């Protein structure tokens, strides 16, 4: 979905493998704030919110607490005390169209 | 998102995982570490906490 209509999914009551995601090395940006990337597999959480959208590359760093920009201000703003991770990966091989 | 555009303007898929815990049971859990069990030896064990 669009960034202004960023897709929200709720994850609960399952085993979530974050070691493979961390060791995938297929994601350009992997920044966790408020959590330990190595301890992600070692913790249990009441609920997970998966927030999916597509942006430009230069705005990838803008999806982080304390960041500013059009997307941050008007599309999706992260709180200063945000607890979670951001995973961004290029989609040129899938989002390339003629014209 | 033109093919000839720069990498800074190239399309990027972004997913943010937000982890909330409340006065409710924990539902999502990470994978458990399984180690081969050994018998007839004085060993340290941890079964389901």
């Amino acid at each position: 979905a669009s960034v202004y209509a960023w897709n929200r999914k709720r994850i609960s009551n399952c085993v979530a493998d974050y070691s493979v995601l961390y060791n995938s090395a297929s994601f350009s940006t992997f920044k966790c704030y408020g959590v330990s990337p190595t301890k992600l597999n070692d913790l249990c959480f009441t609920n997970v919110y998966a927030d999916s959208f597509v942006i430009r590359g230069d705005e990838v760093r803008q999806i982080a607490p304390g960041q500013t920009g059009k997307i941050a201000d008007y599309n999706y703003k992260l709180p200063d005390d945000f607890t979670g991770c951001v995973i961004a990966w290029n989609s040129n091989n899938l989002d390339s169209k003629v014209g | 998102f033109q093919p000839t555009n720069g990498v800074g303007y190239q399309p990027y898929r972004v997913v943010v995982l937000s982890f909330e815990l409340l006065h409710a049971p924990a539902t999502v859990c990470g994978p458990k570490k399984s180690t081969n069990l050994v018998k007839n030896k004085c060993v340290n064990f941890n079964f389901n906490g």
């Epitope: 669009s2 230069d58 059009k70 169209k97 014209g99 | 033109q2 720069g6």
Partner: nanobody, 121 residues
Framework: QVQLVESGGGLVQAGGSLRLSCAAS????????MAWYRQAPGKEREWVAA????????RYADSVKGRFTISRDNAKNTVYLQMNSLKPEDTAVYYC??????????????WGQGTQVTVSA
Amino acid sequence: QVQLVESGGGLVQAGGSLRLSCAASGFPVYRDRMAWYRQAPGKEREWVAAIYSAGQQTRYADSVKGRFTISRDNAKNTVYLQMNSLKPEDTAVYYCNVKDVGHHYEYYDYWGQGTQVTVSA
């Protein structure tokens, strides 16, 4: 290279109909917004019509509502612009316009050539 061309128009008597075509090459018309403006000889320019692919389908000026329709086709990549029951106040030049965003949040407006439409009572 993005190139936009407008076809149609001319001089017609009152009560006629017209069909303008805005053809864009280099980018599909399936995007945020196409705009159409009107320029009259010796008069001020004002926004007239806009078509969007999200949210509200179309927006129009208060002087053109109820007698004027628009459609787009991505397969042949062109926008058709139909006007019925023309009025003498519609005598002006039609401009087709698109917008794009740069790297530094700078906005580039691709402007069309436009076509003259004259309505005689």
